[PDB]
């Protein structure tokens, strides 16, 4: 199966460079070009450039003097580097592969790398419980507070609990830090038997926290 897996999200300081690795599998880099496309918050897609099968590159006109794409065929890796980032380079960056070696119909995409351009510090979240209290259903959750930059991932019970989960969009607080809640509804009678753990991962700060949530005594 064709897959493209990108390096993690993080913060780049203004005027500094962005580096992303796209590691491919299920095909050889000597047989297909790998393209790069970004998406600015709430916007459409912008094609940035490509490294072709044989190592040639093309860069879209706005990026010719600040983008370089290289690869290592033996390691199935493609390296995207862009210099001199400003605020408006904040975006999700994707690598992509076309259906055919020479074409641009992007059938396979990386998961994206959210790059935030800001002068601020990376900060990991605190995780607090939203405890269930007394139609047979209880709601519980986790408050993931005071982190920067986006994103954070939240799962429940190591990915085993997905039904009824709502993970909200983060809000930017007046401190300049994000906060997010993730909630789940479960049968009230499960609260004594089943454990509920929210698994929080803030990759930009390498912060992973598992928080148990239960009724308060």
């Amino acid at each position: 199966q064709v897959q493209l897996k990108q390096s993690g999200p993080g913060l780049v300081q203004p005027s500094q460079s962005l580096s992303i690795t796209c590691t491919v599998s299920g095909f050889d880099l000597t047989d297909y070009g790998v393209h790069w496309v970004r998406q600015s918050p709430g916007k459409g897609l912008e094609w940035l450039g490509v490294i072709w099968s044989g190592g040639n590159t093309d860069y879209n006109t706005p990026f010719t003097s600040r983008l370089s794409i290289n690869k290592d065929n033996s390691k199935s890796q493609v390296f995207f580097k862009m210099n001199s980032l400003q605020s408006n380079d904040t975006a999700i960056y994707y690598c992509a592969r076309a259906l055919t070696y020479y074409d641009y119909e992007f059938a396979y995409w990386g998961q994206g790398t959210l790059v935030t351009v800001s002068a601020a510090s990376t900060k990991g979240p605190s995780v607090f419980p939203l405890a269930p209290s007394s139609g047979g259903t209880a709601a519980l959750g986790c408050l993931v507070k005071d982190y920067f930059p986006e994103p954070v991932t939240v799962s429940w019970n190591s990915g085993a609990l997905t039904s009824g989960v709502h993970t909200f969009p983060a809000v930017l607080q007046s401190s300049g830090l994000y906060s997010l809640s993730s909630v789940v509804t479960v049968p009230s009678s499960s609260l004594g038997t089943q454990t509920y753990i929210c698994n929080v991962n803030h990759k930009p700060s390498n912060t992973k926290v598992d928080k148990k949530v239960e009724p308060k005594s």
Binding site: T61, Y104, F128, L130, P169
Partner: protein, 213 residues
């Protein structure tokens, strides 16, 4: 560069209806248009290539038509899971360019929120701050109002909210509102109340707790 203009910006339809997305190019591009779906927090997914050609794994309800400057993506009977942004891409002319997207929203019957209130944790109160959360679960339409009161004082400006995208199965929204106070202020007051107004509720619903009970 070729400019692609997608219309409408937002398309709101009911399940089972035929839906069409327009993409118009600033000059002729033959049939060199591809279409993508992008679900919330997802990567783009190729639906149709070269205006009308099928892609393996894509449901038959998706089809495309057009040639020249005016292109159409069609979903013949829309399903709840089709909620997404939809983008066109041209590649008749270098560089390949994309439209700004049409967002597909789904109509459904009115559904009242289930409302829950959460006190701040003791763990957080050690930090000096108290977050109080009101959750409005699985409602439709999206419009809702949350009013916070602390011992019957109306709170204004010290809450933030966010809303999920429509659920892929039931087409509902959920909303979280967080009221933020200092520990000191939280411990000076007793009654914390979230009042919810929504089309589905005949009267506003209040969920409240008394601090320390």
């Amino acid at each position: 560069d070729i400019l692609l203009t997608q219309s409408p910006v937002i398309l709101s339809v009911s399940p089972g209806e035929r839906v069409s997305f327009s993409c118009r190019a600033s000059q002729s591009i033959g049939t060199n248009i591809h279409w993508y779906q992008q679900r919330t927090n997802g990567s783009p997914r190729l639906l149709i290539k070269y205006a009308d050609e099928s892609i393996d794994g894509i449901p038959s309800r998706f089809s495309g038509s057009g040639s020249g400057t005016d292109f159409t993506l069609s979903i013949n009977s829309v399903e709840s899971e089709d909620i997404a942004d939809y983008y066109c891409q041209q590649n008749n002319n270098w560089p390949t360019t994309f439209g700004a997207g049409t967002k597909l929203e789904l109509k459904r019957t009115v559904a009242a929120p289930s409302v829950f209130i959460f006190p701040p944790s003791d763990e957080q109160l050690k930090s000096g701050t108290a977050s109080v959360v009101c959750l409005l679960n699985n409602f439709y339409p999206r419009e809702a109002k949350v009013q916070w009161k602390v011992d019957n004082a109306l709170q204004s400006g010290n809450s933030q909210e966010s809303v999920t995208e429509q659920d892929s199965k039931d087409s509902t929204y959920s909303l979280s509102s967080t009221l933020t106070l200092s520990k000191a202020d939280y411990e000076k007051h007793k009654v914390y109340a979230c009042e919810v107004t929504h089309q589905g509720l005949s009267s506003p619903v209040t969920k409240s707790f008394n601090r320390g009970e």
